[PDB]
Design a protein around this nucleic acid. Structure first.
Lengths: 99, 292, 48, 35, 48, 49, 147, 69, 48, 55, 49, 49, 146, 109
RNA sequence: UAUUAUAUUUAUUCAUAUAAUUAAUAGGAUAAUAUUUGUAGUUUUUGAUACCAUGAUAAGGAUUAUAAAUUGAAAGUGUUAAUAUCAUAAUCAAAAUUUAUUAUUUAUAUUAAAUAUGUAUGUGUAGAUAAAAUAAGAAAUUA
RNA sequence: AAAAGGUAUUGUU
């Protein structure tokens, strides 16, 4: 509603006030279509972003946290075209990190 | 008693008589009681419903340059969706009253159309003029709802009235279409509304909604219109809240009455450390979630 | 309030209230106090 | 008008002598009074 | 409606705008106006 | 005798003990510190001589 | 960089003058698309199925365009607006305090008062031509000694 | 690169935004009637360094360019 | 004649509701009388 | 005090005591005591100064 | 100035910057496409630079 | 890791969103408090007269 | 309004003397008339760390105060001035409903929000001595400094 | 005196009103919180959302002293989220490339 | 009825005060001159005290909630702003338990820095009692 | 969650 009001102008307000219901429809127009329309056009399924990967470096830098203070890590996740699996934590092999 | 003495605070340059007399009392049988309120510049006018006493040119300038008050109220309500403002129940309620201004005339004319068995020929200009003049003076406050309805049902219609009726009506209660057409004509001839279709719409919908009630056309004469003791507006008869009929649902914390400020509560009167035990503010969030 | 009084130089309630300057008004310099320049005393010391 | 006529901006409106001598009655009617 | 605070960003992407412009056109009935709604779907950078 | 030596303290009252008003002027911030640079009448006569 | 002006952040591009408007305050700006992104720059192959201007009753751009004055308001913040530079003097500012103004930057004049009214300490100059005195300066007089 | 700057930004007193060549004559609108017609600039008056009288642009109500070099 | 009647907004809270009687008349024919209860002198006067 | 005012003023607490003296010796008397730092001048007034007996 | 985020060049007023010192085509009001060609030639002199 | 993979291949967001790997447990300990014997939860012994 | 500013262009003078000492031009090899103003400037804007460690002495403050006193000047001084006339604001015709109330106070000088040179009577240093004195009779509402 | 700076240029607010609408005036057993706005709070969240101060870059607010509130250093003059970002900035990012930890680490590499 | 769960877990040995005088300003080098180097009128009052001497901020969970949110409140708990008229009680070391309102270290290794607790082995053991649904992981009898 | 009295008139000390 607010934004439909915003899209109006001085001239169009002055105009569509002479009908004296025109402007209430100009504003509530989406609400009119709602209250009379037994439908939700809107079920926006899931947000699906763009890839933000360090171009030269081939890394994704993703943040993560636990307890908000005591654990705050970041994954540098890199694409590996040679099938050589390897997971690293704090600069050391993951098995020897995570015991 | 270890009796307490309070020397009366006398007015000063700094501490005026009004404050020193209401913010302070020298008789300590009222100490630590509670916080009173009162209304000033615009709160007083908002509550007291004192209409501006008009004038000529100046009040008419302020009054002519009004424009569609109902809309401008709506503008002011929505604008709380902008970045620098919040949507406020006070704005919504100024909208709600600027839209429900013509509650009196509407509840009346609905009573007239639908609670008056056999109202003459309302479309006949005689009873139509009774109707026009009564509803005209029901708005404009000169008449009450109750007295005006009695003036309606008592106005002079036609001689040998029962005898003309028992010829046209079996059980006496005529068709209501002439009545409601007359009332919509009433409120569209008298500019009770700025936006015309509104008159008819309320006149129509209030009737439709009542059509569902048991004894949907009897009203206990006391509660029916204004009197001393009335019904809550959800329970009024041709009123706008009667469809807003619902109720609340509460799961209180183990500690729910203590935290009466902790939530994301709008504060009109902000806390200060003298009453505020450990409260931090309505914006702080001790348990934050990570998010872009 | 008290015999051991308020001190107008440390206390935020005083320094901030309407008879002083609040922290959210832009705390600038209000007027430049040139005092040692309008008429400077002569140098006269107790100790000769 | 704009408000109901059985109340004043101070409470209930006093009608008869009882209300005017005992104005508790206008602003208090049980542990669940609300304006 | 665009995002004006980083909250609306969370419910926002052009590839999601696609499923919704499709709601627009699947509910639309004439091609002379599916013309303008497809014109807008291509003009706003909707990931087709 | 002198005018500007007007009362900066009030009539010694109980509004000192009962109210938070400041019994002394709040220190200014943009005031310099008062030093003495100045030559007397005799001292200026000496330099001119 | 070949500066073209001594001041602006990007000196290295010119000053493209723009067309004057005799309707200087009478311009208009569509706001559903401020930047004119909704326009045809070339006739399309989908231009043919176009239903005419019939029933296109309220061509939304014509009812979204605003005259320019409308988008922003000159509110009391703008009527007490504080400057974005060091003002040379605000003596004229008869709207100084009662009307609700406070400068964003102390004016040059009162900075000059605040510089003048007070001295300069001799230990702010740090002149030096002799060097460090290896033997005496530390065993200098027991009063002016380096504790 | 402001055009004719040597007469506009440098030597036009009021920076080219202020219009000096006018009177205090009264016009019947409520805005321009608030300004009384001022009897002209004194013939032989020795005026100050910053203030003129306001007859022309070069002799404006407040001279703008400094006396500095 | 003004009066004062204690008003008990609660068991713990009591107010002094001054109670006015007054008659607003003009011998030109028209005269009414109102009595009121209100917490203050001038507010009870206006109410009456 | 001698610079901004003339006199050297007491504490707020002292002038409290002194005002209460001023007033509780206005409405009534005969409750006081005479505690001094030095008594030689009270036990031994000057050549004159014969104090007044009240009533 | 009156669009989203006017770049810093868009707060300074419509002052007569000298790049209209030379264009003998447009006299005082550039006629149809006159301004568009003058701006194309602003581009041309910029490619010149 | 979940945000790393959403950032490297976006359309993998949807399984990650749905599985709740991009979910933040909005949880922390009870802060450090002296009114608690362990600092976190237990209030000191309460005794009636 | 607040002072003769270019008195501050007498601040570099001691730095001028330092750059002299470092250039090898003896300050005693000046003129004595010029050294008059320069010794004045050295006691004006120049201080030694030793005089700075003890120039803010309270009694030094208060002898400046007493000298200004017996020279009859307590207008510029902080303690010894009493500004009892606190200026009011321009009321607004557009908002006549709000009981306007303050956000701050400052003891600014009186020329800022002044009744203009025509809205006040003609010269009042001479013809109309204005004094805002306190009433001896009690005033509850109404200023104390009439 | 030094008590005369503590003077005043209006006339006061006069206590000539009744309690505003829905003010918590104490009836018998109403647990009273004087602070909460009586309307704007009970106005449902399904409408109003959990905003208690404008959605606007938090560096515009300052936490008040002594008052459990938060006020803006510029006295209520606001600049929206989109003034704290480049034009059309994606998620109002500093540079539309990466987030807070993406920037620093692209930079380290 | 619905807008939705306490019957589980971990707990109980608890203590520290001492040796009387609160009444005021007094500028010092690199400054055009004060011995003001070293500024000498005693003794007319009395409350915050060992003693009556008003006010003003804590502890305490039992039904405003689920989403983008916190499981801590006003009813005032010693020191505080107008009642006077018993007495100096105030830490500069080394100190005297009766005060309800307290989480102690549990059997491989036991005194080094202002000195630093020598008592109570006992079948986890009477009675009544403590805490908690919060980054931990709990599940079913509403007024 | 819903209905309750006073010889008291800050009112069961």
């Amino acid at each position: 509603m607010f934004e439909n009001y915003k899209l109006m102008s001085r001239a169009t307000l002055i105009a569509d006030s002479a009908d004296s219901y025109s402007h209430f429809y100009t504003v509530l127009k989406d609400f009119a279509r709602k209250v009379a329309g037994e439908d939700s056009r809107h079920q926006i399924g899931v947000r699906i972003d763009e890839p933000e990967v360090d171009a030269e470096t081939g890394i994704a830098v993703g943040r993560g946290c636990a307890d908000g203070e005591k654990y705050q890590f970041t994954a540098l996740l890199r694409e590996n075209r040679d099938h050589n699996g390897a997971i690293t934590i704090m600069g050391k092999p993951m098995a020897l990190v995570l015991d | 008693a270890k009796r307490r003495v309070i020397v009366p605070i006398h007015p000063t340059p700094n501490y005026p008589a009004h404050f020193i007399k209401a913010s302070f009392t020298t008789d300590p049988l009222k100490e630590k009681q509670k916080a009173r309120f009162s209304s000033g510049g615009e709160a007083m006018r908002e509550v007291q419903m004192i209409p501006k006493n008009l004038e000529g040119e100046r009040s008419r300038r302020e009054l002519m340059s009004r424009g569609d008050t109902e809309f401008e109220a709506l503008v002011e309500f929505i604008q709380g969706a902008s970045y620098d403002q919040l949507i406020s129940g006070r704005r919504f309620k100024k909208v709600y009253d600027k839209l429900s201004e013509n509650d009196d005339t509407f509840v009346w004319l609905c009573h007239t159309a639908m609670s008056v068995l056999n109202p003459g020929d309302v479309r006949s200009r005689l009873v139509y003029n009774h109707l026009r003049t009564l509803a005209e003076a029901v708005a404009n406050g000169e008449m009450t709802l109750r007295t005006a309805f009695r003036f309606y049902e008592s106005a002079v219609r036609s001689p040998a009235y029962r005898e003309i009726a028992k010829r046209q009506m079996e059980g006496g209660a005529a068709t209501r279409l002439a009545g409601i057409s007359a009332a919509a004509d009433v409120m569209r001839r008298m500019g009770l509304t700025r936006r015309p279709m509104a008159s008819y719409f309320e006149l129509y919908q209030r009737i439709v909604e009542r059509s569902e009630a048991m004894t949907p056309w009897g009203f206990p004469p006391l509660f029916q219109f204004e009197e001393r003791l009335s019904l809550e507006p959800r329970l009024k008869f041709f009123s706008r809240a009667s469809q807003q009929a619902l109720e609340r649902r509460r799961r209180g914390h183990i500690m729910s009455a203590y935290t009466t400020l902790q939530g994301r509560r709008i504060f009109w009167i902000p806390p200060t450390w003298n009453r505020a035990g450990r409260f931090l503010g309505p914006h702080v969030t001790l348990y934050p979630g990570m998010t872009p | 309030v008290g015999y051991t009084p308020v001190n107008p130089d440390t206390s935020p309630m005083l320094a901030y209230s309407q008879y002083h300057w609040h922290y959210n008004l832009p705390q600038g310099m209000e007027r430049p106090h040139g005092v040692n320049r309008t008429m400077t005393a002569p140098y006269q010391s107790a100790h000769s | 008008r704009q408000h109901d006529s059985g109340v004043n901006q101070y409470g209930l409106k006093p009608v008869n002598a009882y209300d005017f001598i005992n104005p508790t009655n206008l602003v208090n009617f049980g542990r669940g009074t609300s304006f | 409606l665009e995002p004006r605070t980083p909250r609306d960003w969370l419910q926002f992407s052009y590839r999601n705008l696609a499923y919704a412009y499709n709601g627009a056109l699947r509910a639309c009935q004439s091609f002379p106006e599916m013309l303008v709604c497809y014109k807008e779907m291509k003009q706003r950078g909707v990931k087709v | 005798m002198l005018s500007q030596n007007v009362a900066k303290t009030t009539v010694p009252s109980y509004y000192m003990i009962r109210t938070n008003l400041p019994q002394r002027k709040p220190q200014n911030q943009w005031e310099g510190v008062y030093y003495f640079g100045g030559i007397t009448k005799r001292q200026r006569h000496l330099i001119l001589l | 960089i070949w500066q073209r002006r001594y001041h602006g952040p990007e000196r290295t591009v010119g000053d493209e003058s723009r067309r004057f408007s005799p309707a200087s305050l009478r311009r208009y700006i569509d706001v559903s698309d401020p930047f004119n992104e909704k326009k045809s720059k070339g006739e399309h192959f989908l231009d043919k199925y176009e239903a005419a201007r019939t029933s296109e009753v309220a061509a939304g751009k014509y009812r979204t365009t605003k005259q320019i004055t409308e988008i922003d308001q000159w509110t009391r913040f703008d009527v007490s607006r504080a400057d974005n530079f060091r003002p040379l003097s605000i003596s004229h500012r008869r709207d100084y305090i009662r009307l609700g103004y406070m400068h964003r930057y102390t004016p040059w004049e009162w900075i000059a008062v605040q510089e003048a009214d007070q001295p300069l300490i001799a230990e702010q100059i740090r002149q030096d031509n002799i060097g460090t005195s290896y033997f005496f300066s530390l065993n200098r007089y027991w009063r002016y000694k380096a504790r | 690169q402001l055009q004719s700057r040597e007469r506009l930004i440098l030597g036009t007193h009021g920076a080219g935004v202020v219009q000096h060549a006018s009177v205090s004559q009264p016009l019947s609108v409520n805005f321009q009637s608030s300004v009384t017609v001022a009897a002209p600039a004194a013939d032989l008056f020795r005026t100050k360094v910053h203030e003129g009288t306001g007859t022309s642009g070069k002799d404006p109500y407040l001279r703008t360019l400094p006396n500095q070099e | 004649a003004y009066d004062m009647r204690v008003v008990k907004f609660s068991p713990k809270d009591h107010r002094q509701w001054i109670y006015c009687v007054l008659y607003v008349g003009s011998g030109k024919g028209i005269a009414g009388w109102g009595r009121a209860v209100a917490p203050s002198t001038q507010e009870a006067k206006k109410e009456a | 005090d001698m610079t901004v005012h003339g006199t050297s003023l007491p504490s707020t607490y002292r002038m409290h005591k002194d005002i209460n003296k001023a007033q509780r010796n206005d409405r009534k008397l005969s409750g006081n005591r005479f505690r001094v730092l030095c008594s030689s001048g009270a036990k031994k007034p000057p050549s004159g100064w014969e104090p007044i007996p009240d009533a | 100035y009156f669009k989203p985020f006017p770049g810093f060049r868009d707060f300074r007023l419509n002052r007569m910057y000298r790049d209209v010192e030379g264009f003998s085509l447009m006299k005082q009001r550039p006629e149809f496409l006159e301004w568009e060609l003058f701006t194309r030639y602003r581009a041309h002199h910029q490619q010149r630079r | 890791i979940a945000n790393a993979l959403v950032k490297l291949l976006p359309l993998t967001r949807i399984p990650l969103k749905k599985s709740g790997l991009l979910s933040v447990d909005r949880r922390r300990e009870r802060g450090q408090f002296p009114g608690y014997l362990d600092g976190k939860k237990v209030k000191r012994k309460f005794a009636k007269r | 309004r607040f002072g003769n500013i270019n008195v501050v262009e007498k601040k570099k003078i001691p730095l001028v003397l330092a750059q002299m000492d470092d250039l090898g031009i003896p300050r005693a090899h000046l003129s004595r008339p010029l050294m008059d103003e320069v010794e004045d400037a050295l006691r004006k804007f120049h201080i030694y760390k030793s005089r700075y460690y003890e120039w803010g002495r309270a009694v030094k403050q208060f002898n400046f105060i007493e000298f200004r006193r017996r020279n009859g000047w307590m207008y510029d001084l902080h303690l010894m001035k009493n500004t009892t006339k606190q200026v009011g604001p321009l009321r607004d015709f557009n908002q006549p409903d709000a009981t306007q109330a303050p956000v701050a106070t400052v003891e600014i000088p009186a020329f800022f929000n002044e009744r203009p040179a025509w809205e006040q009577p003609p010269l009042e240093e001479t013809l109309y001595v204005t004094e805002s004195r306190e009433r001896y009779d009690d005033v509850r509402s109404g200023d104390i400094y009439e | 005196y030094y008590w005369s700076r503590y003077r005043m240029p209006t006339q006061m607010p006069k206590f000539d009103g009744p309690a505003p609408i829905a003010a918590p005036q104490n009836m018998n057993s109403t647990k009273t919180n004087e602070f909460i706005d009586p309307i704007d709070d009970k106005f449902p969240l399904s409408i109003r959302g959990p905003l208690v101060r404008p959605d606007v870059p938090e560096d515009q607010y300052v936490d008040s002293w002594y008052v459990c509130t938060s006020m803006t250093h510029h006295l209520g003059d606001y600049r929206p989220w989109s003034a704290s970002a480049p034009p059309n900035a994606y998620r109002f990012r500093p540079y539309n490339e990466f987030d807070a930890k993406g920037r620093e680490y692209v930079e380290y590499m």
